[PDB]
Write a protein that binds this ligand. Structure first.
Ligand SMILES: Nc1ncnc2c1ncn2[C@@H]1O[C@H](COP(=O)(O)OP(=O)(O)OP(=O)(O)O)[C@@H](O)[C@H]1O
Ligand SMILES: [Ca+2]
Ligand SMILES: [Ca+2]
Lengths: 139, 353
C-alpha cells in the first residue's frame, strides 16, 4: 500500500538489497523502507548532511546512512537535471561493500543499495527512474 | 565480440577485447579525406582531440569511421563498443558521443570508461591512484573499487607535446633549427630514445660535468650530427618543475599528493600503497624512482609508498578495457539500443561512472 509499492517495485528485479523513501523537509522521516535493514534507520543527522550547503567535507570525512559508513563517489545531489549522489559503503576488514545512489525529488530522497558486484550504473539508473515517477506525481 | 577504442590527444588504439594488444595504433589526426597514418605520411598538401577533450565532432566522427571501415574493417552494428574518455570530460560531450554511436553508427551496445580506470584495472587493482600522462594532458585520478573520484581528480596541462616543444626550444637555443614538422618526428624520437629522469636534479646537474656517460650523439637526416648533454634529463624534469616551461603549476609529484589529499581518509593509505603510472609520457627511465622519493618526502614518514609502473603502461588504458569488456559481468554494465531508445543521450550520466 501507498509508499511501499515503490520500495517493493524497486526490490523486484533481483539486483538490490535495501531501498527507502525519506521525505527530507521539516523533520526528515522515513516514508517507506525495506523492513529491518539499514536505510530504515537513517537519521535527521545524516539527511541534513545529504541536503546541506557544504558539498566537499563529506568527501574527506565520509558519511553514514543508518550508522553505516559510506564513501561519496559522485555528488550532484542538489544539481538541476541530475539529482543524484552515488556512493559505495566501507567495511572494516574483509566484508564486501556495495554501491548506493540517492535521488532527490521535490520532497523526497530515494535510496537504493545494490547487491554484491552490482554496477553502480544500473543502481543509478533505476533509482533515478523511480524518483522521476515520484517527481511527476508532484512529490 | 566487443570492440575497444582508446581515443587520445595524439594516438588512437583500437582492437577486439580478449586481445593482448591493439590491432590499430594510429595518430589522431585528419587533413578522399586524410586520416590517421595517411595524414603523417602524405603530410604536405587538425587534431580533433585537445587535452583529452574532443573539440571537433565532424573530424572525431571521421576517425571513428576510419577506425571501423578502413582500420579494423568490421561492422559497427554487429559489435558492442567500449569507448574511453578523459577524467572530467564535459557532460554535453559524453552525450554527443553516445548519440553519434547509436544513431550514426547504429551500435547494438556501448560503454564509456574513464581512461585511468582501465589502467588501474590492467594492473589487477580496483583501489589505487593513477597518474596518466599522454600527449596533451596529465591527470591524477584517485580510484575506489573501480570508481573514479572526480572531486579529487586533478588536471595538469602538460604532457608529451609540451615536452617535445621544450626539447626543440633548447636544441634551437643552442643553434640548430626545426620549424617543419617533418623535422620534429626527429626531436620526438630523440626525446624518446635518449631522455631520462634524474633521481636528484640539482646533484645531477652539478655533477653533470664529470660526464663519462651523459653525452650522446644524434645524426639528423641531413647528415648532420648533434651533441646532447643535460637536455636528456632537463626536458622531462619539466614534469616535476613546470616552471622550466614558463607555467606556474605544481609537478606531477605534488599533484598526485594534492589529489590524495582531497580523498576520504580511510583509503589514503590504500592510495599511497597503490600509485600507478600510465601513458606514453611516463615511459621515461627513472620516473618511478623519482616519484617514489618525491612522495616519500611529501607523505608522513610512516606511510608505506609503492609507485607501480607496469612495463606495458603506454597501452594500459587499452589493455585495461580489453580485460574489462570481455568479462561476463560487463553486459550487466553496458548500454543497449533499447535503453537508448527509452531514454536518449542522457543515459550516459547514469550508467557510466
Ligand atoms: N619511450 C618513450 N619515452 C618518452 N616518451 C614517450 C615514449 N614513447 C611515447 N612517448 C610519448 O607519449 C605520448 C603518447 O601519449 P599516449 O600514448 O599516452 O596517448 P595520448 O594520445 O597522449 O592520450 P592523452 O594525451 O590525451 O592522454 C607521446 O607524446 C609520445 O611522444
Ligand atoms: Ca572516517
Ligand atoms: Ca590517453
Amino acid at each position: 500500500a501507498g509508499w511501499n509499492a515503490y520500495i517493493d517495485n524497486l526490490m523486484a528485479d533481483g539486483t538490490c538489497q535495501d531501498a527507502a523513501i525519506v521525505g527530507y523537509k521539516d523533520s526528515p522521516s522515513v516514508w517507506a523502507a525495506v523492513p529491518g535493514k539499514t536505510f530504515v534507520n537513517i537519521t535527521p543527522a545524516e539527511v541534513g548532511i545529504l541536503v546541506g550547503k557544504d558539498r566537499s567535507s563529506f568527501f574527506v570525512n565520509g558519511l553514514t546512512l543508518g550508522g553505516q559508513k559510506c564513501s561519496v563517489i559522485r555528488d550532484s545531489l542538489l544539481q538541476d537535471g541530475e539529482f543524484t549522489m552515488d556512493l559505495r559503503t566501507k567495511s572494516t576488514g574483509g566484508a564486501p561493500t556495495f554501491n548506493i545512489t540517492v535521488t532527490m525529488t521535490a520532497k523526497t530522497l530515494v535510496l537504493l543499495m545494490g547487491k554484491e558486484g552490482v554496477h553502480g550504473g544500473m543502481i543509478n539508473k533505476k533509482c533515478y527512474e523511480m524518483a522521476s515517477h515520484l517527481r511527476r506525481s508532484q512529490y | 565480440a566487443a570492440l575497444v577504442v582508446d581515443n587520445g590527444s595524439g594516438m588512437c588504439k583500437a582492437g577486439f577485447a580478449g586481445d593482448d594488444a591493439p590491432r590499430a595504433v594510429f595518430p589522431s589526426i585528419v587533413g578522399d579525406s586524410y586520416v590517421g597514418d595517411e595524414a603523417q605520411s602524405k603530410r604536405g598538401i587538425k587534431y580533433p582531440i585537445e587535452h583529452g577533450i574532443v573539440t571537433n565532432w565532424d573530424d572525431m566522427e571521421k576517425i571513428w569511421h576510419h577506425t571501423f571501415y578502413n582500420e579494423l574493417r568490421v561492422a559497427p552494428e554487429e559489435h558492442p563498443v567500449l569507448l574511453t574518455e578523459a577524467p572530467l570530460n564535459p557532460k554535453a560531450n559524453r552525450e554527443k558521443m553516445t548519440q553519434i554511436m547509436f544513431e550514426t553508427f547504429n551500435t547494438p551496445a556501448m560503454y564509456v570508461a574513464i581512461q585511468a580506470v582501465l589502467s588501474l584495472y590492467a594492473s589487477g587493482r580496483t583501489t589505487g591512484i593513477v597518474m596518466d600522462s599522454g600527449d596533451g594532458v596529465t591527470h591524477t585520478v584517485p580510484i575506489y573499487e573501480g570508481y573514479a573520484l572526480p572531486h579529487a581528480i586533478l588536471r595538469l596541462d602538460l604532457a608529451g607535446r609540451d615536452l617535445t616543444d621544450y626539447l626543440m626550444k633548447i636544441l634551437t637555443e643552442r643553434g640548430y633549427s626545426f620549424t617543419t614538422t617533418a623535422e620534429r618526428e626527429i626531436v620526438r624520437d630523440i626525446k624518446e630514445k635518449l631522455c631520462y629522469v634524474a633521481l636528484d636534479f640539482e646533484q645531477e646537474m652539478a655533477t653533470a660535468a664529470s660526464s663519462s656517460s651523459l653525452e650522446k650523439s644524434y645524426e639528423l637526416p641531413d647528415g648532420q650530427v648533434i651533441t646532447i648533454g643535460n637536455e636528456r634529463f632537463r626536458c622531462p624534469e619539466a614534469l616535476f618543475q613546470p616552471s622550466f616551461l614558463g607555467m606556474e603549476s605544481c609537478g606531477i609529484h605534488e599533484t598526485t599528493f594534492n589529489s590524495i589529499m582531497k580523498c576520504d581518509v580511510d583509503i589514503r593509505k590504500d592510495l599511497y600503497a597503490n600509485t600507478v603510472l600510465s601513458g606514453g609520457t611516463t615511459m621515461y627511465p627513472g620516473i618511478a624512482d623519482r616519484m617514489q622519493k618525491e612522495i616519500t618526502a611529501l607523505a608522513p614518514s610512516t606511510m608505506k609508498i609503492k609507485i607501480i609502473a607496469p612495463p606495458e603502461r603506454k597501452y594500459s588504458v587499452w589493455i585495461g578495457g580489453s580485460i574489462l569488456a570481455s568479462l561476463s559481468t560487463f553486459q550487466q554494465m553496458w548500454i543497449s539500443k533499447q535503453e537508448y531508445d527509452e531514454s536518449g543521450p542522457s543515459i550516459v550520466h547514469r550508467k557510466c561512472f
